[PDB]
Design a protein around this ligand. Structure first.
Ligand SMILES: *[C@H](CC(=O)N1C(=O)C=C(OC)[C@@H]1C)[C@H](C)NC(=O)[C@H](CC(C)C)NC(=O)[C@H](CC(C)C)OC(=O)[C@H]([C@@H](C)CC)N(C)C
Ligand SMILES: [K+]
Ligand SMILES: [K+]
Ligand SMILES: [K+]
Ligand SMILES: [K+]
Length: 215
């Protein structure tokens, strides 16, 4: 692996978004992973639709929660790989309640064929990300509300509750670290990002890492 990677510097990551009062983190994680994957497949960076998942993926639970894996599964086994563009299925759940789902004629902004699952090993996740781009991951984020910047070294790491996107790491530093995209607007953290220490499984970050596959 290289000493440091940051996919934002390669234009592979969209603007920081805002889930509102909806527990749809899982959606924003999964969709952000696909957005990056599509670009790295050689297509242009495009905002894809979390509202599609929140409203139409029935195996997950909309604003009451879900899982990135399920979402990749539902997209491929139930939605023929189609991830609609945001422009075409805009986000409407920011108030907290999620609208019903109805679908003549949306614009497919991306086609995935599957997903992969990464080992529960930070070095292995990093080697994959170094080659193939941002990784969907789960974390314990109970210590996060109070975050305003810096590298987290004492993350409460007891129980997973939130999905985010790993977009880089830096093993060069005195304290190595992951770079993670959150979905709580750019008001929160380091313009909407958080760095957490790398190598101590901070926030259980390695426990549930996965990625969509553009095939
Ligand atoms: C998004 C998380 C979130 O929105 N927020 C926080 O974590 C803190 C916040 O403060 C502002 C905001 C509100 C939602 C609520 N979390 C989830 O959807 C998680 C994401 C995964 C951990 C990747 N999923 C679940 O909680 C999931 C719910 C079912 C799939 C319907 O529950 C589990 O993953 C549990 C397990 C962790 C408990 C042992 N599993 C047994 C289903
Ligand atoms: K080098
Ligand atoms: K695994
Ligand atoms: K720890
Ligand atoms: K995994």
């Amino acid at each position: 692996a290289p000493a440091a990677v940051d996919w934002r510097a390669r234009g592979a990551v969209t603007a920081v978004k805002d889930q509102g009062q909806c527990g749809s983190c899982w959606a924003f994680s999964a969709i952000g992973n696909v957005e990056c994957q599509w670009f790295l497949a050689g297509h242009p960076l495009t905002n894809l639709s979390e509202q599609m998942l929140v409203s139409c993926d029935k195996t997950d639970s909309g604003c009451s929660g879900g899982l990135m894996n399920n979402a990749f599964e539902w997209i491929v086994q139930e939605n023929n790989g189609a991830v609609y563009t945001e422009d075409s299925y805009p986000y409407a759940s920011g108030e907290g309640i999620s609208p019903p789902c109805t679908t003549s004629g949306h614009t497919v902004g991306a086609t995935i064929t599957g997903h992969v699952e990464l080992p529960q090993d930070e070095a292995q996740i990093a080697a994959w990300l170094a080659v193939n781009g941002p990784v969907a991951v789960a974390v314990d984020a109970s210590s996060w509300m109070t975050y305003t910047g810096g590298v987290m070294t004492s993350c409460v790491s007891e129980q997973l509750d939130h999905g985010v996107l790993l977009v880089g790491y830096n093993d060069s530093a005195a304290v190595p670290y992951w770079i993670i995209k959150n979905s709580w607007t750019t008001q929160w953290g380091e313009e909407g990002y958080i760095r957490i220490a790398k190598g101590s499984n901070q926030c259980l970050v390695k426990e549930e890492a996965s990625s969509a596959v553009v095939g």
